[PDB]
Design a protein around this ligand. Structure first.
Ligand SMILES: Cc1cn([C@H]2C[C@H](O)[C@@H](COP(=O)(O)O)O2)c(=O)[nH]c1=O
Ligand SMILES: [Mg+2]
Length: 178
């Protein structure tokens, strides 16, 4: 009754999500078979990105060349400052890029880590946790109540399904600062 996180990933996430996540890992010489807790964290963040977007241009998940092409194309269609890193989404409504975080640590710690990495005055940050806690730039949450509620619900489902397999203990304890 300690299961394999790799088998859990391929069984409980959409295959398009798993493949995008495998691609993101192999891109940086990480093996999804080895760094399995990371492989689940990456799938989860991908899934949250897709849920948040249902107005929004998806950046995360794309091949890096295509992602940057898309980011530059928006920045010169609009006024927007060009991010130093490469966000997760663009919001056509509020006309800003967004970075999404999903954390198993304290949401404040993670929010400020992200703010300090990206050093942007324009990019919106929105962090979710597996506890139902969330934090978003200027207390502007962008989406409505039941839409954020659905994301928080999917996060609970992942956590309980990991718990079922004996995987949550290690998953919850193995996030480090980026
Ligand atoms: C969802 C996803 C996550 N990740 C990793 C990097 C980060 O640690 C986290 C998501 O990246 P981000 O939160 O900086 O956008 O998971 C990828 O590398 N590629 C992906 O497609
Ligand atoms: Mg990203």
């Amino acid at each position: 009754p300690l299961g394999s996180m790799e088998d859990f990933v391929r069984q409980c996430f959409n295959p398009m999500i798993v493949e995008l996540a495998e691609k993101a890992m192999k891109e940086y010489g990480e093996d999804p078979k080895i760094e399995t807790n990371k492989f689940a964290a990456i799938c989860t963040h991908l899934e949250v990105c897709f849920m948040y977007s249902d107005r929004f241009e998806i950046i995360e998940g794309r091949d890096r060349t295509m992602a940057w092409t898309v980011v530059n194309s928006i920045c010169n269609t609009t006024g927007v400052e060009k991010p130093k890193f490469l966000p997760d989404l663009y919001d056509y409504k509020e006309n800003r890029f967004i970075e999404i975080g999903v954390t198993r640590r304290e949401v404040h710690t993670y929010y400020l880590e992200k703010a300090n990495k990206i050093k942007s005055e324009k990019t919106h940050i929105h962090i979710f946790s597996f506890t139902g806690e969330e934090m978003a730039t200027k207390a502007d949450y962008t989406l409505d109540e039941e839409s954020r509620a659905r994301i928080k619900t999917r996060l609970f489902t992942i956590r309980q399904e990991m718990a079922s397999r004996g995987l949550w203990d290690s998953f919850r304890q193995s996030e480090r600062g980026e």
